[PDB]
Design a protein around this ligand. Structure first.
Ligand SMILES: COCCOCCOCCOc1ccc(C(C)(C)CC(C)(C)C)cc1
Ligand SMILES: COCCOCCOCCOc1ccc(C(C)(C)CC(C)(C)C)cc1
Ligand SMILES: COCCOCCOCCOc1ccc(C(C)(C)CC(C)(C)C)cc1
Ligand SMILES: COCCOCCOCCOc1ccc(C(C)(C)CC(C)(C)C)cc1
Lengths: 143, 143, 143, 143
């Protein structure tokens, strides 16, 4: 259907494309963060939060994609096709996955308000000229 | 990580293994069932339930896999590899997807109690050898 | 008819006469800013604000100008004339559109008072010669 | 942004498509009307009405387009391209413009109710076959 993975949380794809795709960390970094910070809660038998629910489902989908890529590397013979499939996965699906993981982890960590203000401000910043914007890029911090 | 997509709700992959893989409907059937019963709630900007939160993500994963299948059929010149990939997707990932869709649509339509009692009773029925197995299997119903 | 697009809002062309050309983001940047912050309201059936009204009208004007530029590229056979017209559009009309979009977005974001005080101070700064002004311009930011 | 310039006022492009293109008066006539009736209010420093705001923006866009046409006739030497650009501007853009100006002037002058009723009634008239189409086409009047 026409489902937006962020609108039940108060965001939208138009608001997360408002940031560059070269901004979002790697899938490995984000999954390591998720583990480190919320493993006991994602492996828990509790609806701890919708963020946790969505994050579980996304981690499962990524695991199945990795299984697919390994199965490809094993079975498929044409290296061209194999590399092409694996690259498509890791690039397009990786970008989507890490936008979503960033959103969820960062909301869990800072706040929906904080994260949305950050999106707005960082987009406006990277769109503003340097001479008239602050010189240092915005960054989220618990400290 | 080791995430079970059901223990958040009160089930396990071992409890749903009571049902064989030849049991679950097709993805078309289940997505149509969802579009019939819960479309407006899935397209809604509300955490109506964890079942919705999870079913949305599952539907998005499936949409991305279908997009992948089309992109493959287009951008791959080895029909053998193309067919292999599409078949793997639609078979393995479809089986998992429809396990999950079945669980969610059922616990949304009937409830945890009914669904788990159904799984137990169907395990009884299907572990029972056929000489003593009634024909009237357990069939979820509001009637 | 001797109309000023800001007099209705409490400003003047002579007040924004000082902001340079290098101060305003690109048209794409500003239109994306709008689409991300106020799309649900601009596409709304409500007079949410005079800023919204003006901003809708400006967006439509720019759309018709882009349509013109495309029609030119398609229906003119003198590359010189085509390039000259498209350049004029994107440069002069783009500058005016940037000025206006900036004013409206900035007011909606910060406030009429804040924006007008920023304009006063920025004029004070840009009228001073560099030998006597601070080197870093004033800054309007949410951060 | 998919914006409808009449949706914030209570109309649509499908409701105004009832009226043909050869129905709307000339830009000269409509701007003369606007002057005569609302010059002091359009030149005013007040959000007198959303119609006034929109009308100001439209007049400004038309002025910039006329400036473009003049700049063209001056700089551009290729008569073919010059005439093509000028005629495109006038015909098509002025069609859009006189739609908009008609709507706003008419609403300001008569009423939202009167204008929407006029649109539906002119639809009735123009859909009626000629054998039963009265020659006294509908017309807006305060008498
Ligand atoms: C191939 O079938 C074997 C049986 O699978 C059951 C055991 O695995 C548990 C199911 O786990 C998942 C994992 C991922 C998914 C999602 C929602 C991510 C969808 C999918 C399969 C499209 C990737 C669903 C169920
Ligand atoms: C190539 O990247 C383009 C950027 O598109 C991002 C916006 O598109 C919306 C899609 O949103 C998502 C995000 C994540 C996902 C999940 C979590 C289901 C995982 C994925 C990408 C592995 C299928 C699906 C859709
Ligand atoms: C060529 O005309 C075909 C008619 O198509 C109808 C389209 O829907 C109506 C859109 O109405 C307008 C009216 C004015 C305008 C602006 C304000 C941009 C003015 C213009 C035409 C001077 C650029 C834009 C759209
Ligand atoms: C060439 O740029 C110079 C800077 O502008 C100096 C005058 O500024 C006044 C702004 O005037 C306008 C006029 C029209 C417009 C509209 C909204 C009609 C848009 C446009 C420029 C696309 C025609 C915007 C601003």
């Amino acid at each position: 259907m026409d489902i937006d993975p962020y609108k039940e949380f108060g965001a939208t794809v138009e608001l997360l494309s408002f940031l560059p795709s070269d901004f979002f960390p790697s899938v490995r970094d984000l999954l390591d963060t998720a583990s480190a910070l919320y493993r006991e809660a994602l492996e828990s038998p509790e609806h701890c939060s919708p963020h946790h629910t969505a994050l579980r489902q996304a981690i499962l989908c990524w695991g199945e994609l990795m299984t697919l890529a390994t199965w490809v590397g094993v079975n498929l013979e044409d290296p061209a096709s194999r590399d092409l499939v694996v690259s498509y996965v890791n690039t397009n699906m990786g970008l989507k996955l890490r936008q979503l993981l960033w959103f969820h982890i960062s909301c869990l960590t800072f706040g929906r308000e904080t994260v949305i203000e950050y999106l707005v401000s960082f987009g406006v910043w990277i769109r503003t000229p340097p001479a008239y914007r602050p010189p240092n890029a915005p960054i989220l911090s618990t400290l």
